[PDB]
Amino acid sequence: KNPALRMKWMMAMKYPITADKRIMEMIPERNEQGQTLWSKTNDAGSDRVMVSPLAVTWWNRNGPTTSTVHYPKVYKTYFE
């Protein structure tokens, strides 16, 4: 019932995140240290795959880069 305790408990789990099936062809299963980034396990009722929080940091430090020029202007009020 309390979301905070649930979040704290579930972050201690191994693959608390859900991602698209295509993630397995974008990030390696294990990183440089041998830590597994995702597991070949589907979601409870959908086609999403179980994913570790390490995969988000792996994407943020090694993922493909795109153009982010119009992002500063789309949230015009927030950046102002």
């Binding site: 295509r22 995969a55 430090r61 880069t65």
Partner: protein, 613 residues
């Protein structure tokens, strides 16, 4: 040396260190004071303060309703709900006279609000007594249950989308002799009496009403809010900053024309048994006076909630629990067995409650015609109190003394000016008796009077032009538990709102931010990349740390530092750092093609993931 914190009041005035007298500043872990015995005591107390009323069995109900108003005037200072219709109407008339046109205008804005009122808005509320399951359920499900049962019957107009048609469907259910329910798992039938009694019960949870009355009470609350917004003496429904000025305003208004020889005394007053004495029939009279020279339909809509509150009932909790010392049992009795039962099974104290309540038992629900419950007509009671305060002008008292002040739902502060001490006493007595005439009782034990300059009103301690600025409800310095991106924004927004609503101090806000950031980092394992704490993420967060040239642009979820302070809490973290992030970091973090997101103000980043279900 024996430490004694209270001795701090030998030097510091009490109003300055008043915050040290509040033990919790939050919500204590016992939440006691509720039960069947408490409800029985409440009903007995309500019917005891109005013993000299008129008893009458209701035709549609069959329970003895008590009408105490227009009864004998009280002889002593004990609580009494013997209100007077003529006095109430005179107070309303004088209130309208002193503020010409207020009732008419308030009727216009109430009509404007009532026109486009949506049924879905009724989902916003606390726990509601569901009349189908005979139990407490959230309003979001109670509304669905009632509309679906109405759909099962010939009451399927509430899909018009406007709450007026839903209320009309509620109206039409009154004149149907059979209410049928088909639960997809049985056939249930409620006749006239059963449905009527189930539609007029106040269920324990302080109690809660059913779903057929929340719409009716909302319109009268809106009308009373419109009335109060034009009233200066009311302490509702304003927030904190716009309310702290009202104390100074009323202090100055009573100390300008006053010279140095006219005495001025202020009373920090509290009202005793506020809800056990005010009567819905007087609220009916006030509603009728307010909406005069108005369309019949609008007057009819607003006139029914006092009627139902005059013909309401209180549910008797869940029951009582027994024990045995031989067979080792904990058998219970529900509420429905309190009508016919053996009185030896209870102790001495409960027996008197049962003997007093037994005449009022009808199908497990006690009859409670006089009185109210906790916090239903707070705005209307505030209007009545302001009307009583309005009688303190010199054009109404016609005497050397005159009073004015502030009135909240049940709290009031009253300043009275008079040339002499005897005039002050006479004015206090006249205000007391005028309140007694209208069913308003002032707690003598909880009230005190002194010279003007220091007083209290709704936990606002005014002393020589200063009001203490501390928060009576501290924030939660914890993660909301949504995801990394949402939790930061929600926490900083909570801190900012609590500063701009409860007048949280800047240093306390900074320490709350520190505690929240600590909790966030420990929950999401996102400690700084230069830290020595080792977790499962610590490797990756360090590989992102040395890789990044501008380390002050990294998000906290990415091992970056905290750049938040008092001046930054209105800026989202991504926006706050979108000048120090590296180009590749910006491309990776805000890539639309990331596998974590799929198509309270946060930019969509890779940290906006969906957790496991």
């Amino acid at each position: 040396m024996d430490v004694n914190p209270t001795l701090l009041f030998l030097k510091v005035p009490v109003q300055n260190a008043i915050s040290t007298t509040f033990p919790y500043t939050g919500d204590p872990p016992y939440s006691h004071g509720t039960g069947t015995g408490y409800t029985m005591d409440t009903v007995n107390r309500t019917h005891k303060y109005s013993e000299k009323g008129k008893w009458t069995t209701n035709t549609e109900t069959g329970a003895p309703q008590l009408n105490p108003i227009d009864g004998p005037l009280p002889e002593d200072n004990e609580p009494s709900g013997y209100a007077q219709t003529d006095c109430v109407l005179e107070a309303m008339a004088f209130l309208e006279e002193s503020h010409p046109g207020i009732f008419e205008n308030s009727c216009l804005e109430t009509m404007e609000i009532v026109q486009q009122t949506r049924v879905d808005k009724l989902t916003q509320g606390r726990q509601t007594y569901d009349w189908t399951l005979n139990r407490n359920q959230p309003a979001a499900t109670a509304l669905a249950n009632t509309i679906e049962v109405f759909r099962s019957n010939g009451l399927t107009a509430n899909e018009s989308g406007r709450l007026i048609d839903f209320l009309k469907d509620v109206m039409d259910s009154m004149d149907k002799e059979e209410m049928e329910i088909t639960t997809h798992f049985k056939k249930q039938r409620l006749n006239k009496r059963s449905y009527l009694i189930r539609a007029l019960t106040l269920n324990t949870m302080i109690a809660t009403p059913g779903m057929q009355i929340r719409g009716f009470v909302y319109f009268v609350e809106a009308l009373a809010r419109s009335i109060c917004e034009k009233l200066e003496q009311s302490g509702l429904p304003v927030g904190g900053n716009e309310k702290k000025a009202k104390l100074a305003n009323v202090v100055r208004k009573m100390m300008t024309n006053s010279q140095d020889t006219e005495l001025s005394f202020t009373i920090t007053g509290d009202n005793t048994k506020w809800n056990e004495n005010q009567n819905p029939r007087m609220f009916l009279a006030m509603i009728t006076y307010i909406t005069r020279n108005q369309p019949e339909w609008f007057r009819n809509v607003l006139s029914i909630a006092p009627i139902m509150f005059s013909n309401k009932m209180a549910r008797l909790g869940k029951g009582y629990m027994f024990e045995s010392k031989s067979m080792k049992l904990r058998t219970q009795v529900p509420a429905e067995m309190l009508a016919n039962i053996d009185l030896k099974y209870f102790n001495k104290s409960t027996r008197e409650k049962i003997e007093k309540i037994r005449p009022l038992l009808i199908d497990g629900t006690a009859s409670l015609s006089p009185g109210m419950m906790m916090g239903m007509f707070n705005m209307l009671s505030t209007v009545l109190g302001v009307s009583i305060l309005n009688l303190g002008q010199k054009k109404y008292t016609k005497t050397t003394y005159w009073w004015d002040g502030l009135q909240s739902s049940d709290d009031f502060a009253l300043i009275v000016n008079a040339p002499n001490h005897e005039g002050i006493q006479a004015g206090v007595d006249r205000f007391y008796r005028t309140c007694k005439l209208v069913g308003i009782n002032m707690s003598k034990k909880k009230s005190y009077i002194n010279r003007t300059g220091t007083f209290e009103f709704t936990s606002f301690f005014y002393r020589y032009g200063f009001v203490a600025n501390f928060s009576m409800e501290l924030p939660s310095f914890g993660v909301s538990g949504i995801n990394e991106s949402a939790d930061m924004s929600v926490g900083v927004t909570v801190i900012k709102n609590n500063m701009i609503n409860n007048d949280l101090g800047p240093a306390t806000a900074q320490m709350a931010l520190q505690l929240f950031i600590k909790d966030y980092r420990y929950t999401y394992r996102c400690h700084r990349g230069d830290t020595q704490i080792q977790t499962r993420r610590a490797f990756e967060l360090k590989k992102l740390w040395e890789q990044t040239r501008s380390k002050a642009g990294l998000l906290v979820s990415d091992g970056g530092p905290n750049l938040y302070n008092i001046r930054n809490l209105h800026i989202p973290e991504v926006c706050l750092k979108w000048e120090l992030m590296d180009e590749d970091y910006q491309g990776r973090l805000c890539n639309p093609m990331n596998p974590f997101v799929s198509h309270y103000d946060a930019v969509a980043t890779t940290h906006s993931w969906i957790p496991k279900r």
